[PDB]
């Protein structure tokens, strides 16, 4: 066991190291942000399909990433996340989590609303608590899920361990950005393997997802 | 050995990207664009970022495969320069815009263009809306390497009508960060749409597990 | 189902106002709510709508910087606020969600 | 900067003829998606306005089926088989394809 912690916020891990960095690159560079923010639960259910979140918007709202700098708002950023899985020994599946770059959801939602007065428009930022897939073997785009593993990635298999960190650094074509516009990666987990139980256990096993970003500068 | 199948052995040859008919406005402005004939966006879907010039050639002839001479000219605009907009408009007269002058009866016209990007590469994957805060609808970046324009040279019209191929080369390609291909068939030129009710599986298939 | 608003308002250029429009029945964050202008003796304009759910609020280019839409979720209101008036923006505004279902009555503004 | 134009001023129109009132634009309003996207909307002198058509034929709540409309690509138009005293106002076209939406200029109906 391992308490984790750096400056407010205090996690357990553990003593696995089975990181994954991205593109083997460290997040170089050239106070009250450096913490574990921990996104929301999402239960994994029988027939669920998978969940994406996209960033850096996933921590726009929450926390103060984006708050906006009155001085200029050029940021460069990297991050390292921390996905884990709860269960029991009884149950058993398989979790896919990739981080593939410069993702594009071509399909469409209607959205909230509308009346077939405009049309109807689609939502790409799904923010806090992230959204669910609609044809994984797609994944609302064409590729394909086999070939999901040529992007960093690392596998939750539910008979050996819980956990699966990656470390991304900042990839983009200009050295600073305004965050608002652009969305630079999307984390995607898919269950490539369904969950099964015997009846009479936990219907829905939990998920959390921890973000830390790694020295977000404004300079 | 290994050398044929590195980076630049991938991307080498020459393609015709476009065929433009003039028949008997007179003018033609035919956006450039590596999309737009199939196989190669695939190809290119390969990777996210990609840096590279092109060398364009183009070959003319009649329709029915005969030549006669006709002088031409191949006008290009730079991004962000005002595009004609009639045969006998302001711009075919602007000194910024290059343009080459060519005889039907000599060999093909050969141009290379180097990439003007405000960035550092090409980006075929953009993920936010063109414009802090979102401001308007869609999905397309700001990349693009202007158009073309080409028309004959004279005041009165052709007595004869033209068609022409556009071939396109790439070279010194460099590459970054790879990512998985395309199985679904395309559906529009700028967004990766797909096919809602029937999705194609990748393989084909068989009837039992355990056949050979 | 019925969009009630806020009365008539007197004021002087340079001001800012704000109107309201109340839901009643329907909750409020399913529905985009537009706003639209009507200059007396000129034909229906647009201003913008909105989109209650995380807040998407897009404009018409002519008042991209004057206008403002904003939404509550516990009183259920829609505020449209307008700022630096001139002399042009006397008329009556209405609130509606999507098009066809409702709208609200006129709201007169004066700025002389 | 999309424009659009109906056919001008009031065509006078008595009790039981139709009306014909027609509405053309700049550039196609057929989104990438299969559907194509207009609206007309009825205001009677001193009551807030109300949708009529929804997409480019279909009716809502609309109990005479009087009001029908047709068209497709550049032109579109709303035939009418009989108008009683109820459907006298002013009608507008409503567009939804490009980002500035489009309120039409706006026409009347009279008794001769």
């Known amino acids: 066991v391992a308490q984790l912690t750096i400056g407010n916020s205090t996690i357990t891990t553990q003593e696995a190291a089975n990181i994954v960095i991205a593109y083997g690159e460290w997040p170089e560079y050239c106070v009250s942000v450096n913490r574990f923010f921990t996104l929301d639960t999402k239960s994994w259910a029988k027939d669920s399909k998978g969940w994406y979140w996209k960033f850096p918007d996933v921590l726009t709202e929450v926390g103060v990433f984006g708050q906006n700098a009155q001085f200029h708002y050029l940021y460069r950023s990297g991050f390292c996340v921390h996905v884990q899985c709860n269960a029991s020994k009884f149950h058993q599946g398989a979790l896919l989590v990739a981080v593939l770059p410069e993702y594009v959801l071509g399909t469409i939602a209607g959205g909230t609303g509308n009346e077939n007065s405009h049309p109807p428009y689609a939502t790409t930022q799904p923010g806090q608590v992230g959204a669910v897939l609609t044809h994984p073997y797609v994944l609302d785009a064409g590729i394909p899920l086999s070939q999901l593993t040529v992007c960093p990635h690392q596998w939750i298999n539910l008979r050996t361990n819980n956990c699966a960190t990656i470390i991304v650094p900042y990839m983009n074509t200009v050295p600073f950005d305004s965050a608002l516009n652009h969305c630079n990666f999307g984390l995607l987990v898919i269950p490539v393997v369904p969950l099964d139980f015997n009846a009479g256990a936990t219907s829905e096993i939990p998920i959390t997802v921890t973000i830390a970003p790694m020295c977000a500068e404004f300079a | 050995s290994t050398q044929e199948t590195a980076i630049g052995n991938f991307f080498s040859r020459a393609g015709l990207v476009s065929i433009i008919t003039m028949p008997t406005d007179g003018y033609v402005n035919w956006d450039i664009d590596l999309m737009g004939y199939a196989q190669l966006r695939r190809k290119c879907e390969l990777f996210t970022y990609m840096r590279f010039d092109a060398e364009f050639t183009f070959v003319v002839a009649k329709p029915n495969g005969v030549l006669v001479p006709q002088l031409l000219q191949y006008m290009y605009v730079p991004p962000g320069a005002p595009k004609p907009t009639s045969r006998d408009s302001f711009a075919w007269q602007t000194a910024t815009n290059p343009s080459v002058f060519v005889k039907m009866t000599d060999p093909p016209a050969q141009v290379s263009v180097p990439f003007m990007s405000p960035a550092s590469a090409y980006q075929w994957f953009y993920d936010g809306y063109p414009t802090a805060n979102d401001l308007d609808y869609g999905q397309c970046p700001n990349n693009m390497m202007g158009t073309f324009s080409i028309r004959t040279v004279g005041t009165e019209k052709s007595p004869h009508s033209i068609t022409l191929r556009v071939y396109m080369r790439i070279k010194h390609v460099r590459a970054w960060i790879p990512r998985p291909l395309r199985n679904q068939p395309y559906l529009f030129k700028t967004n990766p749409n797909y096919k809602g009710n029937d999705i194609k599986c990748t393989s084909t298939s068989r009837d039992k597990i355990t056949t050979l | 189902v019925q969009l009630v608003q806020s009365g008539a308002e007197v004021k002087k250029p340079g001001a800012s106002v704000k109107v309201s429009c109340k839901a009643s029945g329907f909750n409020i964050k399913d529905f985009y709510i537009h706003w639209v202008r009507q200059r007396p003796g000129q034909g229906l304009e647009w201003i913008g709508w909105?989109?209650?759910?995380?807040?998407?609020?897009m404009f018409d280019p002519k008042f991209q910087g004057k206008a403002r839409i904003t939404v509550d979720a516990s009183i259920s209101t829609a505020y449209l606020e307008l700022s630096r008036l001139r002399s042009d923006d006397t008329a009556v505004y209405y609130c509606?969600?999507?098009?066809?279902?409702?709208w609200g009555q006129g709201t007169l503004v004066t700025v002389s | 900067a999309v424009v659009m134009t109906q056919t001008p001023l009031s065509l006078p129109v008595t009790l039981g003829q139709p009306a014909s009132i027609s509405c053309k634009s700049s550039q196609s309003l057929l989104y990438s998606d299969g559907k194509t996207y207009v609206n007309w909307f009825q205001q009677r002198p001193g009551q807030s306005p109300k949708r009529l058509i929804y997409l480019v034929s279909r009716l809502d709540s609309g109990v005479p089926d009087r009001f029908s409309g047709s068209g497709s690509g550049t032109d579109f138009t709303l035939k009418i088989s009989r108008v009683e005293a109820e459907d006298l106002g002013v009608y507008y076209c409503w567009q939804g394809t490009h980002l500035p939406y489009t309120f039409g200029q706006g026409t009347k109906l009279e008794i001769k």
């Open positions: 909105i989109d209650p759910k995380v807040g998407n609020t």
């Open positions: 509606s969600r999507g098009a066809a279902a409702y």
